[PDB]
Amino acid sequence: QIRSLCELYGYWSGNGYELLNNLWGKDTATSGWQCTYLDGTNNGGIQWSTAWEWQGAPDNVKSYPYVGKQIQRGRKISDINSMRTSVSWTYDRTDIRANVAYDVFTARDPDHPNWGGDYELMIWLARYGGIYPIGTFHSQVNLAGRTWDLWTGYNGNMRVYSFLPPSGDIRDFSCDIKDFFNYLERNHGYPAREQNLIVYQVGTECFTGGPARFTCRDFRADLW
Ligand SMILES: OC[C@H]1O[C@@H](O[C@H]2[C@H](O)[C@@H](O)[C@H](O[C@H]3[C@H](O)[C@@H](O)[C@H](O[C@H]4[C@H](O)[C@@H](O)[C@H](O)O[C@@H]4CO)O[C@@H]3CO)O[C@@H]2CO)[C@H](O)[C@@H](O)[C@@H]1O
């Protein structure tokens, strides 16, 4: 690896991307740790991985290490035409409580900190070990060439929309996240004209299990 980010909130940035050893829930663990590795920045993308083992509090996320596309504050979702992104990944085992997911926060306050927002949009590409997203099942949705189970609920005051695969995982994926926002704007009254983009990330939420290793073979993200 080019860089090993094994410290709590170990951080790298470059080429308009960033990487964080985001162990935000680790104090709920009874044992374990996690490191995030920058493997490459080849071909306009990021190659990275994270290794971990966690015990304790099986409904509590211990971490969400991520790669993020850096964005400028004050961009209304309605004024973003496209958020094209692709990811290729593997997990070395699936007998773990973990997901792989895109995470996007938006807020009416354009200076909202990056830990949250008014709304969260997640696109889950894996759902291992019997975990649940925030909230309850809402409906099925056709987007990005697939069928999704949409779940909705609240994390504090933040409304969370999570799009889940009905079956299996999706280890090679590409989409335009604006298709997901546009669907929410039309059918869920999502206030895109007053919401600013806060973060644009992909990573893995880790609850319990391991030793496990997530490899992101390639990540690319743009927005226009
Ligand atoms: O909290 C500060 C922290 O936030 C990080 O971003 C989090 C979001 O805050 C969060 O909404 C979301 O994590 C969800 C996860 O998707 C769900 O699977 C999980 O669901 C739990 C649920 O909470 C329980 O009620 C239920 O009983 O069990 C299920 C699991 O089976 O809930 C969590 C939130 O608790 O996604 C984001 C990524 O982790 C930021 O990354 C960080 O910067 C902040 O400090």
- CATH number given to 2-224: 2.60.120.180
Active-site entry in 18, 53, 185, 205: 205
| Cα 61 to ligand 1 centre (Å) | 6
Give yes or no for a cis peptide into 211 (omega within 30° of 0): yes
Are 175 and 156 within 8 A, CB to CB? Answer: no
Residue 66, classified by CB atoms within 10 Å of its CB into exposed (0-12), middle (13-18) or buried (19+), is: buried
Sign of the CA dihedral with 207 first, then 92, 6, and 174 last = negative
Q: Is 61 in the pocket of ligand 1 (CB under 6 A)?
A: yes
Give the angle subtended at the CA of 49 by the CAs of 43 and 7, to the nearest 5°. Answer: 120
Are 23 and 32 within 8 A, CB to CB? Answer: no
Task: Give the span between the Cα atoms of 183 and 48, in whole angstroms.
Answer: 31
| Cα 116 to ligand 1 centre (Å) | 10
Sign of the CA dihedral with 76 first, then 135, 103, and 112 last = positive
Q: What's the 3-state SS for 76-108?
A: EHHHCCCCEEEEEEEECCCCCEEEEEEEEEEEC
Show me where the domains of the chain are located: 2-224
3-state secondary structure of 28: helix
CA 189 from centre of chain: 23
3-state secondary structure of 26: helix
CA 105 from centre of chain: 10
Q: Is 8 in the pocket of ligand 1 (CB under 6 A)?
A: no
* CA nearest ligand 1 atom 18, residue: 133
Give me the torsion for CA of 113, 87, 9, 61, rounded to 10°: 80
| Closest of 87, 86, 59 to residue 205, by C-alpha | 59
Active-site entry in 7, 18, 120, 194: 120
Task: Give the span between the Cα atoms of 156 and 174, in whole angstroms.
Answer: 30
- Residue in the structure block whose two tokens are 């030793």: 211
Q: Is 155 in the pocket of ligand 1 (CB under 6 A)?
A: yes
* CA nearest ligand 1 atom 36, residue: 103
Amino acid of residue 158 = M
**What is the DSSP code string of 150-188?**
EEEEEETTEEEEEEE-SSS--SEEEEEHHHHHHHHHHHS
Long-range contacts of 180-188 (CB under 8 A, 24+ apart): 180/121, 180/123, 180/143, 180/144, 181/77, 181/80, 181/83, 181/121, 183/141, 183/143, 184/121, 185/77, 185/78, 188/152, 188/161
**Atom number in ligand 1 closest to CA 160:** 11
How was it solved?
X-ray
